[PDB]
Every structure is written in structure tokens, then in C-alpha cells.
Symmetry: C4
Subunit: 395 residues, 4 copies
């Protein structure tokens, strides 16, 4: 028998009974999210490996809510976080993105004093109705990243003093005793500063950080545009499967998940959210913008900015597959210093003032096509099997 359709009728059916006959089918058209994200059946999937199937439209795209949670206590009007990278997020980006309803995560490749001064400028900043404002203060929300070394405790204290709302524990692999203990330390020292723990790609890693007290999870290992060629990497996970697996588990505890790495367009954003992510983090997509740090320069007629991985030799010196313009494939500088990312340049993207509304509109249109009015409904329909998917072959 046909497992995808009921037996064919003997004679033509009445078109007015089409909706009744649709209910006789053994399963929905395409795949459920649970069927798509099966490691044994389909392997590890990236965003480009599948599509979301269209649903029913009964609302304009302007009615779509993109409201989501970055952490268990932080609600954002736009599910966009800028990456804590020295060529992506400083105070200018953190302010601009917050004004558009997103959230900036200021990098830590500077002294704790310089970082605290950047956090302070975001918090003190004074047309933008979607603005990410802290409810009782009306100040813009501010995030920042730190490592999990003993000296990071003192760094966080200066950041807390500067008015920090949320902290990102910056790591290629957050499932360590060092990060687990550091989370517990923040939960006891600063209970009001939300903790985004990671990076994680497995359910087992997520469970450790959820139990430690993480308020949000940063998902991704090897997915970044400036990440060393994956043919050179041994440990990681394809981003789609990573986003699904972690959020499938984390959502049971109400812990929002941030899809970090490999977001190159609106489609990637829609797909990451459709997989269970509550928000996305962008490095590459926000690099080369006016609000990003670093100077513009010309490279063979093109106006560019440097965009680099934080594990690149250049970023580590205290001063790679999918990528825009150019890049250099470095591997080592010191035998002890193993490069984990690349340094290159990205073309001028203009201001985020024009770019972020484009991403916002495009995402409302994508959710409308899927028949979805909110991120909450997107997730609910993904878990129920109402929201359908289809794998795409090479061609």
C-alpha cells in the first residue's frame, strides 16, 4: 500500500469535498520537523539542506510579530543579536541594534575598563518605537561577552557596575567544569544579570549548562563564516541539527536558544527560528556596516572593513569557507597558538538603519508564507507537525 496517500478513488471526486478528502490522508504533505531532524535518517543538516513548506495566509505580513526571548527574562521585538567580535560589536553597534529592537553583545578583546566604558555609553545613551529598553529604567539593553578564567570575575564586576543586563560566556565549547562553575558564580553574585552560556551543539552539553543555571544558550560549533575550513575541523556539528537538537531539549525548561553562526540571509534566520531557536546571532551579516567597529579602507576599488574570527592569529595577538570579499588561511603563528578562525575583509553594507528594517520585513514575509503570525506560533506548529518541511538534494 501507499504510505503517503489513501487508495485512489474509482471515479472523480467532487471538488467541494476536497477538504474532507484531505483528512483521509495517512500523513501531512512533506515532513514534520521531527522527521526532518533525524540523524540516522537524514544525517546532519545545515540551513541550505531544507525548505519550510508554505501554509495558509489569512493576515497581512505587517501583522507578523517577531517578538522573542533572548534569555528567560529578556524579551526583544527583533530576534537579532550582534556577535561579540572586535569587527562587529562595540557601543555604536550595541546602541543602533537595540534601537531597532535587537540586542548587542560587546566583545572582550580590550581591557575590562575599556569594555565597561563601552557598556556605560550604551546604558547612558538618550523615531524608534521597537527599541530594546529595560522596562523599569527606559535605558537601552546591553549585552557583553567574557571568558571563564579567574580574571573574568573582576571583568564582570566592572561590567555590572556599568549597568550590564546580560552576559555571554565566550567559548568554542561551553560544556566545561570552568564554565559550569562560572555560571553558578554569576547566579550567586549577580542574580539579575542574565547568563547566556555556550557554545553548545548537543543535547548533553545543553543539559549541563541548563542545570548550572544558564538563562539562554548560544548554539554553534564550526558554523561561523570566518571559522577555519570544516575539512580541517574534527569537532562540531552542522548548524541546523545543532539548533534543533539543543532547542528540542532546552524548550522543555523554558531556556531560549540563540542560533549562532552561518546566518547569511533572511532565509537562514527564518529556518533557524523554525527549528526552535528563539533568536539568531550575526557576525558576518553585521560586519562592514557603518555601526560596526574598525575603519573602512579600499581593497582593489572596493570599500571594505576587516572581518575576522576571534580565534584568528590577528584577533588573538591582542590588537575559511563561506565569506565575503577576501580571506587568508592561517593555521599557526606560535606552535602553542593554533588558529581557530580566519581574518579577511567584507564589502561595505551601509548603515544597519536601512539593513535591519530590510531583514525585519523579509522575516515577516517568510513567516507569512509559512502561515505563521508569531515566533511562539512558529514553534508550536513546528512541534505539532502542522509546520512542514522538505529536504533539498544537491540539485
Amino acid at each position: 500500500t501507499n504510505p503517503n496517500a489513501p487508495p485512489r478513488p474509482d471515479s472523480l471526486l467532487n471538488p467541494s469535498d476536497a477538504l474532507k478528502h484531505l483528512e483521509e490522508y495517512p500523513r501531512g504533505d512533506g515532513l514534520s520537523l521531527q522527521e526532518l531532524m533525524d540523524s540516522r535518517k537524514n544525517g546532519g543538516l545545515t540551513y541550505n539542506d531544507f525548505l519550510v513548506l508554505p501554509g495558509h495566509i489569512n493576515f497581512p505580513a505587517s501583522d507578523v510579530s517577531l517578538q522573542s526571548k533572548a534569555t528567560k527574562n529578556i524579551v526583544l521585538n527583533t530576534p537579532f543579536l550582534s556577535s561579540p567580535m572586535d569587527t562587529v560589536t562595540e557601543d555604536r553597534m550595541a546602541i543602533a541594534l537595540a534601537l531597532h529592537g535587537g540586542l548587542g553583545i560587546i566583545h572582550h578583546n580590550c581591557s575590562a575598563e575599556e569594555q565597561a566604558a563601552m557598556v556605560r555609553r550604551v546604558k547612558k545613551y538618550e523615531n524608534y518605537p521597537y527599541a530594546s529598553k529595560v522596562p523599569e529604567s527606559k535605558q537601552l539593553y546591553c549585552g557583553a561577552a567574557i571568558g571563564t578564567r579567574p580574571g573574568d570575575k573582576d571583568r564582570l564586576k566592572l561590567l555590572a557596575e556599568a549597568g550590564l543586563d546580560v552576559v555571554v560566556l565566550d567559548s568554542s565549547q561551553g560544556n566545561s567544569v570552568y564554565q559550569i562553575e562560572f555560571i553558578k558564580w554569576i547566579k550567586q553574585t549577580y542574580p539579575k544579570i542574565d547568563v547566556i552560556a555556550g557554545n553548545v551543539v548537543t543535547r548533553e552539553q545543553a543539559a549541563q549548562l541548563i542545570a548550572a543555571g544558564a538563562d539562554g544558550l548560544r548554539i554553534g560549533m564550526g558554523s561561523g563564516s570566518i571559522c577555519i575550513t570544516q575539512e580541517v575541523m574534527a569537532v562540531g556539528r552542522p548548524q541546523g541539527t545543532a539548533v534543533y537538537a539543543v532547542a528540542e531539549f532546552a524548550s522543555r525548561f523554558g531556556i531560549p536558544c540563540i542560533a549562532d553562526g552561518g546566518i547569511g540571509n533572511i532565509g537562514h534566520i527564518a529556518k533557524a527560528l523554525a527549528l526552535g531557536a528563539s533568536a539568531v546571532m550575526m557576525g558576518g551579516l553585521l560586519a562592514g556596516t557603518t555601526e560596526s567597529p574598525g575603519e573602512y579602507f579600499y581593497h582593489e576599488g572596493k570599500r571594505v572593513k576587516v572581518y575576522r574570527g576571534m580565534g584568528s592569529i590577528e584577533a588573538m595577538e591582542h590588537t575559511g569557507l563561506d565569506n565575503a570579499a577576501t580571506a587568508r588561511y592561517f593555521s599557526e603563528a606560535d606552535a602553542v597558538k593554533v588558529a581557530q578562525g580566519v581574518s579577511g575583509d567584507v564589502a561595505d553594507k551601509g548603515s544597519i538603519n536601512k539593513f535591519v528594517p530590510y531583514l525585519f520585513t523579509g522575516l515577516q514575509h517568510s513567516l507569512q508564507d509559512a502561515a505563521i503570525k508569531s515566533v511562539s506560533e512558529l514553534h508550536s506548529c513546528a512541534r505539532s507537525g502542522s509546520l512542514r518541511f522538505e529536504l533539498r538534494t544537491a540539485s
Copy 2:
């Protein structure tokens, strides 16, 4: 045991018993259409992902009937519809294609008056024995596209007055309350003008439009040659699976299906029909022809015409993967204006007078190779499992 063959004989079998032994096999060679088009087993398929297996020939290719239904009331001698695009279909293309036994769908990127004047020229037009003539009038058949906004009701009235036979409701996603209500409006206002509803890629979407009163379904979402790179798209479906899934359902109600987008050669046409489509719609294949609108121009020694998506910035301004000659990858012009297609150019293809007979002959030869004499038999054999298929890997 071997599920594909019976046990091997102890000694050689007699070649005169080959046909008797063939009936001992547990299944036919290759795959049935139902086995090929399994989302869980094979993922989403495009035309290039499979082949049709050859059958038995007992007729010349000239005996193959390519007669099919564009809608439940319109019978065409050639299953070819030209796309409603400003660089594909105006009156010249609608007349020429109709004379060859096909059907032209005039675009709506003009005033309702200009569009009605184009429809009128097709209807008034007065060597071509395959000609798509309306039975009781002997005039050439004419199709036209419209949107589903309130002002489109008035547009259709001017088109109806001009002698319009069939209307295409022009949309990237036709499963909306706006289109469903617009179909019901046409069925009550103009019961004699056939409605082609869409675009649709799922069985669930098809059911809504069939129940509303659609006379034909336009299938495709993201398959078009001028469609924005699918790595940028979030919602859609691979064309083969879309064509199969929709026609598997629609054929139960006698609603013909039009395979729209990604037809680049005869093989694509044969495969779309073999999947269950009653006809194909061509944009790219018919662009650059003498009968298509727009002027010829030279681009670095090559005689070309512009070919563009209707969702391109250039088409929207009221004046991308698989593609001929050149293209530009636009994404936005206005933050509110999100590009859904690209504008490029296509090489001179000559007249359709030489081109359409080539497509017709080639398609008769393809059906002959499969052992098929008509579109009706092609479908019957596809559903029975007599017509076989084979998936093709990357190599």
C-alpha cells in the same frame, strides 16, 4: 532473500520462456512513481534528480498525442503555456503560441486598459492546424493574469469584456483568504471564464483552492530561473515533489495542474507531465524569442533581450541561480520592497515558429521512448506502476 529478484535457477533457462520468467519477479525494474516521490525515503526532488525508464515501442513518434487540459474546460493540442511576465507574454506571444496549439497568459504589469487591449488583439486575430481555437467561435484562446486586490475585480471586468477565456490569479502563495474569496467572486461573476489558481506546492494548499472553485492549479514556489538564489529563500519546494504531490491530490477531483518554473529543456517538460502535470508553463524558455515583448539589444557581441522576475526591483518599479547570459543579484531598493526575483538578459532564441515545433517533436520522441502514446496514458501508467523511474546520484 533478494527483494528485487526471485531465487537464481539451478541451470540455464530457455530464452523462449523469458516473458514467463519476467512475471516471477517480486517487483518491476526501477521505481514506481509512488516510490520515487517519497519525502521520507528520497527527500525533495527536482527534474534533474531522476530519469524515466524506457518502455515498449509499437508506434511511430508522429502517432503520439500531446493533447492535454490547461483547465477543466480548456483542451490544448500542445501542453505549453507562456508565463504572465512582462518580458515573455503580450499579444504577439499569446497569438503565436495559440497558433501552435498552446496558450498565452498575458501579464498585468500595465494598466487594466492596456491589458484588455492586448487580450482584444488576440481574440480579434484572423497553415496552423493545431491552433488553440475556442470551439463555438473559432477565435484563438487567450489567458491573462491578475492579482487578488480589490482593484483586480475591475481589471477582470475589462478583460472579460475583451473576450478573456481564462484568468490566472498571480501570486507567489495562492493559499490565502484573499485568493480563496477572489476565486469564489469570479465563479459567481464570470462562471464561463476558467480560473487558474496558485502558486501552490503542497497538497494542503491545493485542497483550499480546489474547494474554492479553481479550474486549474499553477504549481511552483522557488523553481523559476529568475527566482532569488534558493540559499536566500526560506519557503518553497523542489519542483518535482511539488508537481507530484499537488497533481496526486488534484487529479482525484479532475483539476489539471500546471508545472510552472524550472522548465529549461524537453526533458523537463516530459518529466513534469510524467509526474502528473497536465501542462507546463514557460518563462525562461520563451524569453528572447521574436514574439516575446521588449527590444533586442547587444551585450558584448551577443543579441539579447531582458528577462526578469516579476518580483525583481525593476519589474515592481512599474516600468538568481539557473539563468541564460547575465543577471544582477538585487535584494532591496526600499526597506519595505523586498526583491523576490532578479533582472538579467537572455540570448536571442529566434522565432517560436521554429522553436515550438522542435519542443513538440522532442516531446513526442520522449513519450515514445517511455512507450507512451498520449498524456492520458502517461498518467494512467504513472499511477499503475507500469511507467518506471530511476533516481540519479550526483555522478
Copy 3:
């Protein structure tokens, strides 16, 4: 439980018991031929899609017999047939290949008189111990191709008179009433001239031609190096699956199978034979050689010969993916004339006197690596599951 291995031992096993423990495994390492060639499990496979796993060597490569049957009555020392193509086989190639133990199939893109004169030169021809000699006459074996039109009956009579040993019924799809009736005609007129029928890619097609009285089967549809891009083709089959499926059935009746098309190297030959083919047919591999017809010419410093498909506009005028040097992508010349292949050029390959011994030696070495001493043993081990295979992914 693990379906590929028995439970792991509690403590280390004795290395002297390795052969005893090997027999405790639930299945052989890798895949059986029946497991590899499963359409539902693996799709349609080409030669590049898999490898043959190595076996046990207990003989030198020089002990490998490459003796096989081209037809049920013709035994060849070398399983190589040259293709009946106007740029591959005339009398010079037919003589040279026969002297090396193979078999030439003279083309029919000439008058029946010219073709009969070429057959006669092979038969009259008078260092080469592997020579394909007819047993009771000591003359070189000669093959020739014909179509299945009424005028081909008279062509075959002139060829029979010239001393023809074997006839190839030349067709892109041999499963027709025209070929079936033509086979019966030859079996009754010339019972002593072996018939190679085809081309075929399915078990169902093979059964028809076996029942008609074919002495050998020519396998391939769309596999040829000069064959129109498969993205343009609708009907055919990946060569590996075609070779397997047809020979799995044909071998039950003792009908040898010729793997025709897509042989570009020794590995392809070994794989075609390992799949069940009794011999291979080469067009591309034998084009550009001294013995092939047509003049050498220079093309931008390179010494070349034309190599073209018999369905190309140039071959049809009575005078495309995998290919050497250059090619032109023609599609039509006359609306009635649909191109089925391409015309291009191939680099000078030298004489077959140096080339054929290279292919012979290489093939002995391949069979030795698989632990196989003869074509008969290769087939026996392929059917028993002793000969193992492995699918290869893209990387």
C-alpha cells in the same frame, strides 16, 4: 544489537583464532552486489558511485583470464568491442582490435556496398596469439551495425555475403516491435550470424529481446560520452544500475551483456564486468587512435580527430557532458531533426597496439586485486556475495 559485528569479547582474543572469529560475523564486510544495486536503497548508480573491495591474492596478474563471450556463440580473449561509430570503427579498427583479441563493430553511416566492402577487408586480412579468429576458418571475426528499417534487410544480405559473423541492431531503444520482428527475421534468414540486440537499460526491455532470439544484449541509454547533457534527456538510466539489472536477468538465459557507453578508463571496464557484463563497448576510449577513421588535424596546438555521436546533427547529415578536448551543444538543425548527441574532437591517443595491451594488463591487475582469476569467477563471486562492494559518497 550491532547488525554488522558480533558482541565484543570480554578479554583479548588469540590472533591465531582470527579466521575462526571471522566466521562469527553476521555478514561480510561492505556490500554484496545485490545490496549495492538496490534502486529503493541506493538510487541509480554509475561506475564512479562505488568501488570493488579487495579479496585474496594467490596468483600472479599474468594468470588472470580475460576470456569472455560477446554473444552466446562468440568467445573473445579480450572483452573489448569497438563502437559502431563513423569516428571509431571501419575496417582498420575492426582488424587491429580483432588481432588484440577484441571485436570491431563497423558503422553503417555509408552505403550498404561501402559497408560490405569494409567487412570483406576484415574477413580477407592475412605476433598476435590472442587474435579473434573464427574457429573453422582462421579468419578474423567481424561485426557490423545496421538499423531495423525495411532497407536494412538488403544491407544485411550484402554484409552476410562479405562474411559477417555478428550483427548489431543499432538503436537508442531496441524494445520496439520493429526490432523484435527484425531479430526474428535474422534468426530465420541467417541463423549463423549472431544478433546483438539493443540498446536496453531495463529487465522488461531485455526480456522482449531475449524472447525474440537475441544472442547478446547491448546495454546503455544516455551513458555515452558524446550523449546530449542528461539534464536535457528525459528517458534513460545510470549505467551501473542498467548493466546490473539487465545482466541479472539475461545471465539466467545465458545471454551475454555488453556494457556500452561511459567507459573512460580501466576501472570502468572492471566495474562493468563485476556488475555482470560479459564485455564492454568503447566509443570515446578508441576515438583519436591511429586505427580509428577520420583524419588527424590541429586545434590550437593539439593533434586531434573528430569524435561525434551518431545522433549528432553532423553524423545524421549523411557525411555533451563527459568528453575529451572540445564539443558543441547543438539541439536541432531541422525542426523534425532533434539532436541526440554532440560533435567534438579528441586528443591523439596513439596506436591501439600500445593502448589495448595497457588496458589488458590493467584489467588483469584489477581482477587480481579483487582476488579473481577469470570473468566467469568474477560473476560467480558477484552472485554468491563473496565479491564485495562499497558505495562512495561525493567526498
Copy 4:
């Protein structure tokens, strides 16, 4: 029901119970090694086809032991063996690699006297705490390769006299009666010189060599960077599946396995070991280094060294896919001489003194990410299912 997750809870779960809920899951996230390396389910896999999933970190990377066994009696601090190739290993490389904790295998493309003189220089050689020293002598360990022809018996005697610790039986296919008998000959003549037998890619081949008395297995057939394009090869196996299949069996007898061929970066090393290999062999990665044999020369501005396969026409004359700088695709020189590899050049890599510590550090970091402290634990976790994997699609 969902086979990958338990039913979803009715209301939110407590994050402090995350570790308890994790134990309710029907299976671990991702795949077990046994699930990944299933030929019927996933086909033949190379290193690039999968990733290792991250585990739990509770130690610094500097605490990772890379100590492993090259043979049943030889313990190495670094699991690196240099390939016995005339452009990779002579005395300089054997000494340098041994000093870094690895093991050099001196080539045999020289007289037995010259080879014995190279072995002697390694053994007589007199800052390096990881040094591969023979326990009772304090001399550096030395390996060497030989063939299995009668004259190789006399070659080994001169090598034994020179102080040889381990012998590699050099072959593209070691499962022969010639190698099996040669192993037994060494076991009886020189019981104290460890035998590395191969090359092997199947469990059936491994069983023969284990039963003969091999102390280690050299795994690989067609995986080498200088190996003739695999589209030309008929017999072999994808490296990942080869490494897994052989080590799954060999580990039951305590016979270490050497992953030989296709190691181009640290990730490949980590993956080969994670699959069950006890060590890796490098040709390409160690060619172009100061310690490798052959002179540096300039090729269009680049400082290079020749790197060639031992089956290349140039290496055989007693004087190809994945590859650095350049290469030539030779196939034959003499009709009897069939090329099995290519000759090309590789860019200057500098000294191994800087390169080997880079590889060592990188590998400690990879094992740390997987939550693994030693090679022994890596294997134990791979067999238990604690160490997880994920397949990677093309994108």
C-alpha cells in the same frame, strides 16, 4: 512516536532536573560510531563525511595523552608515522620524527646496502623528552619498508643487522599468499622485529594478516594524496570505513591499526584515531619539509620539493586528486608498467620541529573538545557509544 526524544511535557520542567530528564531520552544525541559506520545505511565514508560531537571538558588540553601503539610491542608518545616514500622518509626524517615521539619508516627505493646504512644512522644517532627511544638501549626507534619478493629476505637481514626495530611489508594489497608466507618467515627468523602488514581495507584481509602473525596493520587503498584519480581506480575503499572496519576487528586481538593515506590536517588525524586507529601514517603532510629527502627547487616563484607516489612512473624507474601545488596525470610508460600513482611537487612546509608540535597541540585540543583525555579513552568511548558523531551532507 518520536524515536529520538521522549514525549514533550505538559508544562515547563525545572532546569535543576535537566540532568535527570536527559536520562529519559531513548538514545544519545547524534550517532554512535557503530551507527555512523554502517555500509548499508550510510555508504562508504571518508574523513570529510562526518564530525565528532563535543563532550564534557574537565581538564586542560595539556593533560591530554597522545600515547599510542604503532605495533603490539611499540609504544609511541606521538601517534605519527612517516610514510616509506623516497620524497618523505630517509634517515633525517626518521631521526627528527623519532625525536618528536613519532616513528619513521625508511623507504626501499634504493639498494639494500643504502637502506641498511640509513637505518644504521638512525640507530647510531646521539631538549627532546617525548623521544621514541627503545627501552633497554636508549637508541631512537627505526622502521623500514620492504617488498615480499625472495630478494627482500636478504634485504631484511641487512636491515636487522643495522638495528631495525620494525618492518613494514610494502604493498597496495597485502592479502596475498606471498605476504602471508613472508610474515611467517619474519616471525620465525626475527621474532623481535615487529611486522606491520598491509595495505588492507577489509575485515577479511585483516583476518588473514592477523592469523599470519602481523604485529600491526597498515590501512588504506586509494586514499593517498598522490594516488591515481579514484574515477580511474576499480578496487579500494573510502578511508573512514576502511579504518573503522579493520580496527573494529583487529582491536579484538590487540593488533594496532595504522590509518595510512588521506591525512591532510589535524582533523583527519583526530577522526582516524576516533574511528579506532592507534596511529596515522603521513606522506603528503610530511613532504616538502626540511627533514624530507630531495632538493628544494623553484617552480614559478614557489620554493617546492617533488612529492610522488611509489607507483608513479618516476618512482618505479629506479631513480591525482587531493594534492598540493602541481601534478602530472601519467597512466603508462611501458604497456606492462601501469602507473598507480602520480609525481608532482609540494610547497615548502619548513622544519618538522615547528610543524610536529603544531600537530601535537592541535590534536590535544581536538580530544579535549570531544571530552577525551587519552587515545585509550577515545577508543573505549567510541565502542561504548559515549563518543558521538554526526554525518555531514554536501552543504
